[PDB]
XYZ file of C-alpha atoms in Angstrom:
688
model
C 113.526 19.696 210.900
C 115.944 16.946 209.904
C 115.808 15.100 206.579
C 117.424 11.739 205.702
C 118.687 11.409 202.105
C 119.783 8.022 200.664
C 121.966 7.541 197.589
C 123.906 4.526 196.283
C 127.495 5.490 197.164
C 129.526 7.461 199.749
C 131.141 9.697 197.085
C 127.688 10.696 195.837
C 126.513 11.151 199.430
C 129.282 13.647 200.246
C 128.709 15.535 196.990
C 124.934 15.816 197.578
C 125.471 16.911 201.198
C 127.739 19.708 199.986
C 124.862 21.216 197.979
C 121.877 20.460 200.294
C 123.490 21.953 203.398
C 122.189 22.097 206.933
C 119.269 19.954 207.953
C 120.013 17.095 205.542
C 121.784 13.898 206.575
C 122.964 12.081 203.394
C 123.773 8.396 203.697
C 124.795 5.664 201.303
C 123.026 2.326 200.744
C 126.078 0.808 199.023
C 123.837 -0.135 196.092
C 121.118 -2.788 196.440
C 120.167 -3.811 199.990
C 118.076 -6.887 199.038
C 118.355 -9.718 196.573
C 117.001 -13.155 195.842
C 118.520 -15.904 198.045
C 122.129 -16.753 197.159
C 122.333 -19.916 199.330
C 120.158 -22.138 201.500
C 121.084 -20.131 204.618
C 119.604 -16.919 203.130
C 116.111 -18.445 203.391
C 114.441 -17.128 206.598
C 112.739 -19.623 208.927
C 109.257 -18.480 207.788
C 109.973 -19.543 204.211
C 111.823 -22.837 204.884
C 108.424 -24.537 204.510
C 108.257 -23.363 200.849
C 110.054 -25.747 198.473
C 110.607 -22.892 195.980
C 112.281 -20.558 198.539
C 115.910 -21.436 197.677
C 115.240 -20.684 194.008
C 113.637 -17.481 195.337
C 110.751 -17.298 192.808
C 107.330 -18.941 193.096
C 106.583 -19.607 189.453
C 103.173 -20.957 190.454
C 102.099 -17.682 192.120
C 102.850 -15.208 189.355
C 106.634 -15.374 189.932
C 106.411 -13.955 193.424
C 109.974 -13.145 194.633
C 111.563 -13.835 198.004
C 113.722 -10.755 198.644
C 116.087 -11.107 201.590
C 118.669 -8.766 203.090
C 122.125 -9.896 202.031
C 124.152 -10.676 205.170
C 126.858 -8.137 204.239
C 124.090 -5.459 204.018
C 122.394 -6.086 207.393
C 124.388 -3.441 209.267
C 123.643 -0.880 206.547
C 119.897 -1.582 206.832
C 120.215 -1.437 210.619
C 121.927 1.984 210.572
C 119.409 3.400 208.064
C 116.490 2.213 210.269
C 118.018 3.885 213.307
C 118.612 7.158 211.425
C 115.078 7.105 210.064
C 113.636 7.152 213.598
C 115.015 10.714 214.059
C 114.051 12.607 210.874
C 110.859 14.286 209.690
C 111.212 13.328 206.005
C 112.975 10.769 203.796
C 114.462 11.653 200.385
C 115.442 8.849 198.005
C 118.035 10.181 195.565
C 119.107 7.093 193.616
C 119.567 7.193 189.827
C 116.292 7.674 187.945
C 116.672 4.660 185.679
C 115.039 1.301 186.469
C 118.044 0.097 188.454
C 118.007 3.159 190.768
C 114.186 3.113 190.904
C 114.286 -0.514 192.058
C 116.807 0.405 194.770
C 114.468 3.169 195.931
C 111.529 0.753 195.918
C 113.515 -1.763 197.974
C 114.467 0.906 200.520
C 110.770 1.701 200.936
C 109.839 -1.968 201.276
C 112.602 -2.566 203.826
C 112.544 0.664 205.863
C 108.732 0.998 205.932
C 108.707 4.788 206.575
C 106.016 6.446 208.709
C 107.003 9.946 207.472
C 106.719 11.731 204.103
C 108.898 10.449 201.265
C 110.282 12.496 198.341
C 111.837 10.700 195.353
C 114.561 12.992 193.870
C 115.750 12.526 190.258
C 118.591 14.375 188.541
C 121.162 13.652 185.805
C 123.951 15.921 186.948
C 125.144 16.780 190.393
C 125.276 20.576 190.558
C 123.837 22.947 193.143
C 120.970 24.060 190.821
C 120.243 20.503 189.707
C 120.102 19.078 193.235
C 118.018 21.953 194.586
C 115.534 21.564 191.705
C 115.270 17.831 192.265
C 114.596 18.207 195.999
C 111.851 20.771 195.365
C 110.193 18.796 192.535
C 110.100 15.086 193.529
C 108.947 12.463 191.040
C 106.260 9.888 191.779
C 107.656 6.372 192.231
C 107.429 4.655 188.842
C 106.282 1.062 189.415
C 106.629 0.230 185.707
C 110.405 0.826 186.029
C 110.514 -1.327 189.178
C 108.552 -4.089 187.371
C 110.959 -4.026 184.423
C 113.952 -4.334 186.772
C 112.299 -7.196 188.648
C 111.386 -8.965 185.392
C 115.019 -9.021 184.349
C 116.187 -10.132 187.822
C 113.735 -13.057 187.786
C 114.526 -13.858 184.162
C 118.218 -14.080 185.032
C 117.442 -16.340 188.010
C 115.193 -18.705 185.967
C 117.598 -18.773 183.050
C 120.427 -19.732 185.390
C 118.249 -22.292 187.212
C 117.317 -24.068 183.942
C 120.505 -23.706 181.850
C 123.369 -23.998 184.359
C 122.792 -27.747 185.022
C 123.029 -28.432 181.281
C 126.368 -26.601 181.140
C 127.619 -28.515 184.213
C 126.691 -31.922 182.862
C 127.671 -31.368 179.223
C 130.676 -28.994 179.339
C 132.308 -28.320 182.761
C 131.197 -27.897 186.403
C 133.011 -24.595 186.792
C 130.781 -22.693 184.273
C 128.030 -20.186 184.919
C 125.080 -19.530 182.644
C 124.782 -16.013 181.244
C 122.139 -15.393 178.570
C 123.245 -12.097 176.939
C 126.873 -13.025 177.689
C 126.484 -16.205 175.601
C 125.207 -14.105 172.671
C 128.138 -11.712 172.832
C 130.435 -14.733 173.020
C 128.717 -16.193 169.924
C 129.455 -12.969 168.008
C 133.149 -13.396 168.764
C 133.165 -17.172 168.147
C 131.376 -16.735 164.814
C 133.991 -14.241 163.635
C 136.823 -16.588 164.653
C 135.116 -19.428 162.754
C 134.810 -17.158 159.697
C 138.544 -16.429 159.950
C 139.331 -20.142 160.301
C 137.302 -20.958 157.148
C 138.648 -17.964 155.159
C 140.903 -18.664 152.148
C 142.931 -15.880 150.556
C 143.126 -15.097 146.825
C 146.046 -13.418 145.047
C 145.569 -10.562 142.587
C 147.934 -8.051 140.955
C 147.818 -4.570 139.538
C 150.247 -1.755 138.704
C 151.047 1.208 140.926
C 152.175 4.172 138.814
C 153.927 7.329 139.989
C 152.993 9.986 137.429
C 154.654 13.391 136.879
C 152.537 16.250 135.503
C 155.189 18.979 135.988
C 156.438 18.795 132.388
C 152.973 19.484 130.911
C 151.621 22.013 133.466
C 154.461 23.720 135.416
C 152.018 24.910 138.108
C 150.779 21.388 138.924
C 150.570 21.040 142.711
C 151.479 18.370 143.744
C 153.612 17.710 140.622
C 153.625 13.935 141.190
C 150.908 11.584 142.322
C 150.016 7.912 142.437
C 147.465 6.007 140.402
C 146.527 2.324 140.131
C 145.705 0.222 137.075
C 141.941 -0.366 137.057
C 141.066 -1.523 133.517
C 142.654 -3.464 130.628
C 141.077 -3.584 127.135
C 137.684 -2.720 128.624
C 137.777 -5.329 131.401
C 137.867 -4.013 134.944
C 140.888 -5.294 136.923
C 140.021 -7.522 139.898
C 140.482 -6.012 143.372
C 140.241 -7.552 146.838
C 136.497 -6.897 147.107
C 135.817 -9.086 144.028
C 136.545 -12.438 145.791
C 134.350 -14.466 148.120
C 135.495 -15.777 151.513
C 136.965 -18.882 149.832
C 139.078 -16.998 147.259
C 136.719 -17.510 144.249
C 135.388 -14.567 142.222
C 131.985 -13.224 143.171
C 129.153 -13.683 140.648
C 129.092 -10.045 139.569
C 130.391 -8.009 136.633
C 133.224 -9.541 134.629
C 136.778 -8.726 135.779
C 140.277 -9.767 134.693
C 142.467 -11.233 137.463
C 146.071 -10.246 136.798
C 149.098 -12.147 138.096
C 152.778 -11.218 138.286
C 153.439 -12.182 134.666
C 150.552 -10.309 133.067
C 150.952 -7.213 135.258
C 154.681 -7.051 134.524
C 154.111 -7.503 130.784
C 151.529 -4.697 130.828
C 153.918 -2.388 132.668
C 156.678 -3.294 130.225
C 154.552 -2.226 127.252
C 153.950 1.133 128.964
C 157.663 2.042 129.189
C 158.525 5.091 127.118
C 154.863 6.115 126.676
C 152.749 8.929 128.115
C 149.355 8.694 129.840
C 146.374 10.951 129.017
C 143.812 12.410 131.433
C 140.367 11.210 130.341
C 138.147 12.370 133.257
C 138.777 14.704 136.198
C 136.042 15.676 138.673
C 136.039 18.024 141.665
C 132.986 17.569 143.877
C 132.406 19.498 147.128
C 131.377 17.765 150.328
C 130.183 19.033 153.696
C 130.697 16.861 156.779
C 128.424 17.406 159.783
C 129.871 17.255 163.332
C 129.662 14.085 165.416
C 126.667 14.037 167.790
C 127.256 14.481 171.527
C 128.365 11.286 173.278
C 125.970 8.587 174.445
C 127.183 5.570 176.439
C 127.894 3.458 173.345
C 129.939 6.093 171.540
C 131.763 7.148 174.740
C 133.009 3.577 175.238
C 133.908 3.222 171.559
C 135.929 6.443 171.393
C 137.548 6.026 174.828
C 138.660 2.606 173.611
C 139.962 3.681 170.191
C 141.501 6.981 171.277
C 142.449 6.590 174.967
C 142.914 2.778 174.901
C 140.574 2.390 177.893
C 138.658 -0.858 178.315
C 134.891 -0.376 178.431
C 135.022 -1.370 182.135
C 137.696 1.294 182.836
C 135.723 3.955 180.900
C 132.545 3.307 182.932
C 134.510 3.190 186.227
C 136.019 6.604 185.401
C 132.719 8.031 184.166
C 131.050 6.926 187.416
C 133.597 8.976 189.389
C 133.223 11.990 187.115
C 129.463 11.784 187.563
C 129.414 11.359 191.352
C 131.911 14.225 191.747
C 129.885 16.683 189.652
C 131.940 16.864 186.419
C 129.635 15.268 183.793
C 126.006 14.287 183.252
C 124.729 10.771 183.920
C 126.807 8.233 182.020
C 124.147 5.559 181.209
C 122.147 7.111 178.410
C 120.996 6.412 174.890
C 120.249 10.093 174.228
C 122.418 12.421 172.194
C 120.198 15.416 172.997
C 121.619 18.533 174.674
C 119.641 20.923 176.825
C 119.293 24.510 175.635
C 121.725 25.664 178.333
C 124.332 23.083 177.270
C 123.968 23.999 173.567
C 124.617 27.642 174.463
C 127.562 26.723 176.724
C 129.208 24.622 173.994
C 128.606 27.279 171.305
C 130.163 29.969 173.477
C 133.235 27.862 174.216
C 133.711 27.084 170.509
C 133.519 30.813 169.621
C 136.041 31.752 172.346
C 138.564 29.084 171.315
C 138.091 28.892 167.544
C 136.254 32.052 166.407
C 132.899 32.989 164.921
C 133.561 31.097 161.680
C 133.869 27.801 163.538
C 130.515 28.015 165.344
C 127.613 26.377 163.534
C 125.542 29.213 161.977
C 122.438 27.934 163.831
C 122.323 25.851 167.026
C 122.542 22.076 166.509
C 120.088 19.746 168.212
C 120.662 15.995 167.809
C 117.161 15.049 169.012
C 117.292 11.266 168.601
C 114.199 9.742 170.212
C 114.967 7.700 173.327
C 113.031 4.524 174.093
C 112.384 5.640 177.699
C 112.722 9.340 178.485
C 112.016 8.599 182.152
C 115.351 6.834 182.540
C 117.878 9.091 180.864
C 117.199 11.909 178.436
C 120.485 13.856 178.016
C 123.783 13.180 176.232
C 126.956 12.664 178.272
C 128.461 16.155 178.533
C 130.268 18.356 181.080
C 128.065 19.280 183.997
C 126.721 22.743 184.749
C 125.444 25.840 182.989
C 129.031 26.704 182.035
C 131.463 23.873 181.372
C 134.752 23.839 183.269
C 137.621 23.940 180.740
C 140.143 21.099 180.766
C 142.964 23.542 181.593
C 140.888 24.641 184.628
C 140.345 21.018 185.683
C 143.810 19.688 184.949
C 145.103 20.685 188.383
C 142.213 19.119 190.405
C 142.491 15.870 188.455
C 146.289 15.461 188.344
C 148.359 12.667 189.909
C 146.250 9.583 190.652
C 143.191 11.142 188.980
C 144.771 11.430 185.476
C 142.327 8.895 183.932
C 139.439 11.125 185.064
C 141.045 14.159 183.445
C 141.621 12.344 180.182
C 138.058 11.109 179.926
C 136.651 14.500 180.994
C 138.719 16.158 178.249
C 137.392 13.729 175.611
C 133.797 14.480 176.675
C 134.385 18.255 176.726
C 135.995 18.168 173.292
C 133.168 16.049 171.800
C 130.487 18.345 173.226
C 132.084 21.558 171.953
C 132.732 20.009 168.533
C 129.045 18.997 168.271
C 128.092 22.700 168.091
C 130.748 23.721 165.539
C 130.448 24.406 161.782
C 130.527 21.651 159.131
C 133.881 20.667 157.666
C 134.278 21.380 153.936
C 136.483 20.176 151.132
C 136.716 18.571 147.716
C 136.406 14.903 146.745
C 138.701 14.241 143.781
C 138.454 11.637 141.013
C 140.749 11.004 138.060
C 140.484 8.586 135.118
C 143.672 8.204 133.048
C 144.125 6.237 129.824
C 147.151 4.774 128.059
C 148.319 2.049 125.705
C 150.475 -0.983 126.550
C 151.277 -2.537 123.207
C 147.895 -3.207 121.606
C 145.847 -2.996 124.813
C 144.244 0.131 126.190
C 144.814 0.493 129.951
C 142.946 2.694 132.437
C 144.559 4.120 135.590
C 142.579 5.582 138.495
C 143.323 7.932 141.362
C 141.197 9.556 144.050
C 141.776 12.311 146.527
C 140.189 14.459 149.184
C 140.898 17.956 150.457
C 139.929 19.641 153.711
C 139.577 23.324 152.777
C 137.831 24.125 156.097
C 138.287 22.001 159.246
C 135.151 23.168 161.057
C 134.440 20.918 164.056
C 137.413 18.693 163.153
C 139.695 21.284 164.715
C 138.083 20.281 168.052
C 137.265 16.558 167.602
C 138.275 13.839 165.117
C 137.143 10.249 165.647
C 139.829 7.546 165.908
C 139.739 4.704 163.370
C 139.325 1.155 164.679
C 142.801 -0.325 164.873
C 141.740 -3.706 163.370
C 139.332 -2.465 160.668
C 141.692 0.351 159.583
C 140.673 3.197 157.289
C 141.223 6.903 156.805
C 140.567 9.437 159.572
C 137.930 12.127 158.848
C 140.595 14.887 158.665
C 143.086 13.054 156.443
C 143.864 14.669 153.102
C 144.979 13.031 149.827
C 146.102 15.751 147.400
C 145.959 15.605 143.590
C 146.961 18.301 141.080
C 144.312 20.082 139.073
C 144.205 18.405 135.642
C 142.226 18.808 132.430
C 140.814 16.139 130.062
C 143.393 15.525 127.332
C 146.403 16.577 129.419
C 149.512 14.440 128.926
C 151.376 12.848 131.877
C 154.842 11.291 132.142
C 155.470 8.019 133.995
C 158.095 8.218 136.756
C 157.882 4.646 138.048
C 155.810 1.585 137.242
C 155.473 -1.179 139.839
C 153.672 -4.472 139.273
C 152.042 -4.918 142.661
C 150.911 -8.153 144.294
C 148.074 -8.513 146.777
C 146.198 -11.107 148.805
C 142.710 -10.912 150.266
C 142.527 -10.627 154.056
C 140.302 -12.485 156.580
C 137.520 -10.449 158.235
C 138.818 -8.332 161.124
C 138.526 -9.475 164.751
C 136.438 -7.313 167.087
C 137.975 -4.768 169.433
C 136.107 -3.747 172.564
C 135.021 -0.686 170.575
C 133.667 -2.675 167.645
C 131.931 -5.225 169.902
C 130.065 -2.385 171.681
C 129.083 -1.068 168.247
C 127.752 -4.484 167.227
C 125.863 -5.010 170.525
C 124.217 -1.633 169.947
C 123.415 -2.211 166.266
C 122.051 -5.717 166.895
C 119.851 -4.292 169.655
C 121.324 -6.696 172.228
C 123.249 -4.284 174.465
C 121.889 -1.388 176.514
C 123.728 1.598 178.034
C 123.722 -0.166 181.392
C 124.967 -3.512 179.993
C 127.609 -2.917 177.248
C 130.539 -2.839 179.620
C 129.351 -5.509 182.036
C 128.777 -7.946 179.101
C 132.266 -7.266 177.752
C 133.907 -7.525 181.153
C 132.065 -10.722 182.150
C 132.865 -12.663 178.964
C 136.550 -11.967 179.625
C 136.474 -12.779 183.371
C 134.636 -16.096 183.045
C 137.298 -17.199 180.532
C 135.263 -17.138 177.414
C 137.294 -14.385 175.706
C 140.773 -13.019 175.960
C 142.704 -10.071 174.545
C 145.501 -10.268 171.999
C 146.575 -6.645 171.823
C 143.299 -4.858 171.190
C 141.602 -7.924 169.622
C 139.042 -10.117 171.409
C 139.849 -13.810 170.824
C 137.558 -16.663 171.939
C 138.930 -19.484 174.099
C 138.345 -23.110 173.161
C 135.755 -23.607 175.912
C 133.853 -20.677 174.321
C 133.664 -22.791 171.147
C 132.365 -25.755 173.199
C 129.670 -23.796 175.013
C 128.631 -21.816 171.909
C 128.321 -25.054 169.917
C 126.202 -26.718 172.602
C 123.758 -23.782 172.680
C 123.665 -23.464 168.853
C 123.145 -27.188 168.265
C 120.533 -27.946 170.937
C 119.110 -24.641 172.346
C 119.468 -22.400 169.323
C 116.657 -19.962 170.135
C 118.574 -18.924 173.288
C 121.532 -17.520 171.255
C 119.595 -16.172 168.285
C 120.391 -12.478 167.706
C 116.829 -11.488 166.714
C 115.096 -13.373 169.557
C 117.556 -11.805 172.026
C 116.966 -8.248 170.759
C 113.189 -8.828 170.870
C 113.444 -9.870 174.553
C 115.466 -6.753 175.384
C 112.785 -4.677 173.579
C 109.989 -6.432 175.518
C 111.671 -5.629 178.882
C 111.743 -1.993 177.732
C 108.004 -2.172 176.952
C 107.449 -3.324 180.561
C 109.465 -0.301 181.738
C 107.194 1.948 179.638
C 103.984 0.378 181.028
C 103.010 -1.258 177.680
C 103.587 -4.876 178.791
C 102.952 -6.540 182.137
C 105.647 -8.239 184.217
C 103.413 -11.210 185.045
C 102.189 -11.687 181.461
C 105.750 -11.571 180.129
C 107.183 -14.040 182.662
C 104.295 -16.495 182.249
C 104.649 -16.422 178.414
C 108.443 -16.746 178.502
C 108.694 -19.428 181.190
C 105.560 -21.527 180.583
C 104.866 -20.713 176.919
C 102.326 -18.430 175.306
C 101.003 -16.961 172.086
C 102.868 -13.650 172.308
C 106.105 -12.318 170.866
C 107.971 -12.778 167.630
C 107.210 -15.976 165.674
C 109.073 -19.083 166.888
C 110.582 -17.369 169.931
C 111.171 -19.250 173.191
C 107.700 -18.191 174.419
C 105.887 -19.209 171.266
C 107.677 -22.547 171.104
C 106.371 -23.624 174.540
C 108.488 -21.636 177.027
C 111.944 -21.925 178.634
C 111.010 -24.767 180.998
C 109.897 -27.032 178.144
C 112.699 -25.915 175.850
C 115.491 -26.863 178.234
C 113.796 -29.922 179.659
C 114.255 -32.070 176.581
C 116.004 -35.427 176.847
C 119.657 -34.547 177.472
C 120.818 -38.166 177.188
C 121.193 -37.621 173.453
C 123.697 -34.788 174.014
C 127.070 -36.513 174.181
C 129.535 -34.603 176.380
C 132.490 -35.995 174.417
C 131.515 -34.379 171.106
C 130.495 -31.162 172.898
C 134.054 -30.769 174.154
C 135.601 -31.641 170.758
C 136.224 -28.833 168.275
C 136.800 -30.212 164.775
C 139.585 -28.352 162.960
C 140.471 -30.196 159.736
C 141.792 -33.480 158.410
C 145.534 -34.044 158.191
C 147.151 -35.082 154.875
C 146.256 -38.716 155.551
C 142.572 -37.855 156.032
C 142.648 -38.333 159.849
C 140.536 -35.747 161.737
C 142.355 -33.357 164.047
C 140.355 -31.684 166.803
C 140.818 -29.690 169.982
C 139.531 -31.336 173.160
C 138.634 -29.156 176.120
C 139.748 -31.225 179.098
C 139.670 -30.695 182.861
C 143.226 -29.375 182.682
C 142.626 -27.182 179.652
C 142.668 -27.687 175.898
C 144.759 -30.134 173.913
C 145.082 -31.216 170.272
C 144.076 -34.798 169.420
C 143.880 -37.194 166.485
C 143.467 -40.950 166.157
C 146.409 -42.857 164.643
C 147.389 -46.479 164.088
C 148.988 -47.984 167.191
C 151.475 -50.824 167.468
C 148.640 -53.310 166.867
C 147.369 -50.959 164.140
C 144.219 -50.167 166.110
C 143.208 -46.520 166.735
C 145.382 -44.811 169.379
C 145.073 -41.181 170.575
C 147.967 -38.852 169.774
C 147.845 -35.656 171.840
C 149.530 -32.263 172.262
C 148.703 -29.750 174.955
C 147.589 -26.279 173.941
C 147.995 -22.826 175.427
C 146.111 -19.646 174.647
C 149.342 -18.434 173.041
C 147.963 -19.883 169.773
C 144.778 -18.206 168.527
C 142.240 -20.537 166.907
C 142.765 -19.165 163.393
C 146.543 -19.567 163.862
C 146.307 -23.324 164.529
C 146.737 -24.366 160.891
C 147.457 -27.918 159.741
C 151.162 -26.991 159.564
C 151.148 -25.760 163.157
C 149.250 -28.854 164.303
C 151.844 -31.201 162.776
C 154.538 -29.197 164.583
C 152.737 -29.577 167.900
C 152.311 -33.298 167.221
C 156.050 -33.751 166.509
C 157.129 -32.528 169.956
């Protein structure tokens, strides 16, 4: 009575074997065992008579794939076949999402069992979860397998059609990547917005006011306020200017400068201000939901400074070793046992007052419940505390401890009571010579921390802002109360260009645009950095010059392929295949050959990928593709970056010795970010 069990990895195999016990042999497939051909030599002799076999897809026979065993996986397949000959049953215990379902399907196609097969699905590796899964197998879900295969074939066809354009028009060393190119466009577009941004100056007055002379119990006795109106005209702030430094077409404002702000402050010397309005308004802040993949990568990035790749590598270990639930999920739902476990831990650490009065369920509907239906949380019916786990995960496993702690803290905080406090507003009037001025101040208290004692989100380092537990205190004041002026400071400001993305804020955008999925956020972000499209300047993602070249080529000549809405619709359509609401063959025929289905003017409705890419490329001039226009110099001569074989350089045409146009050049490193290469910097590079 021997049973063979197959999982993706050796760590998972040892952990399952520890719970299944005697009579189970648990082996690892090392991931996928088959793939489309990667080179001519992968094509077996039987298929060398098929001209499509190297591409690996017969588009004329409903996109029939040629799956072959990768040469580095032959010995794995050979061992599994030999083991199979000596067992009475086969258990396939890969992940239950479409990736793991496709691996199970491939193992069946390759191993061809003559014995019963049980497909085991679980989202945490605990003795009760593994025992349950073995006793209650799931039927193989061919809709999941078809969705996985649709994406595999899509990626192969996309690469087959688009790569040669990139090679001919940009550089031979480039690889096509469809969703990668969209993420790169997001980053390029932001850099272009920063390059085109022009700042505007505006001034106000910062006042330090002292209320201790009027009300001796004022706490705090001093506070800050800013000038917000003059003679019934609102003072301009940074939000009132457009991206070129001109006022928006909204309500009238007055833009102060140094002179007018200083003159206003001067007319306020020796006078008192008067409280006009003072409001105290309660707020109640609900806890953050339990983690899903997107918010785990965002918070691990902002708080722990982990890259999304590092976070998912750590989470994989924590999952395979039994510490957390499955880490690729769009659910924030907790099981009844995990709600009760979190609520008990909160009570024991923070007291009855800090537990939510009723249990909190964050039942956000998941697009496919078959693939992952629980939040990322500590595994088991009772969560191991961090203190309990700190010893097991010390030394070289410190990353695992730190991410486990973050997950534990988030999960307990999700079952805690709302935070409470007061939002504070203050409107203050005075007179500067003949002109009435208004001063404004705001404030926020935290009278009850609630869940914030256990978890506070970290603000994005580039966007900035106030943390959810920060407090800004203001004394209690009454309309008509007099205030003395301690200090008056005319204060100068400039508008700021839109923030670059961090890894955290790019994940957030990929999720909100509907372009990323739990299984793809981190691989997109890692791949755009490894293939040289994007690099890191501190925590900021900065596009390289070749990213401008490739993004421009796609935008100018293949625009539907990098359109955010068309991309999100394709990702949604693949999900419909996974749910059994759309057919693999129908989808591939419509996308590749053209069809009457999908959103208006998509690749499919315009005639299909094959026709879209196969336009006349002679009109695409490689020289302009690899030329990024920056600006004219003071003589009106265009300056541009050229992406050469040896990397980028600055260029402009100038009068030679004969007076005819002559190239002047200056080589460029990624030390200079694109929005830093101003005209002034360019002239400096041209001098050397």
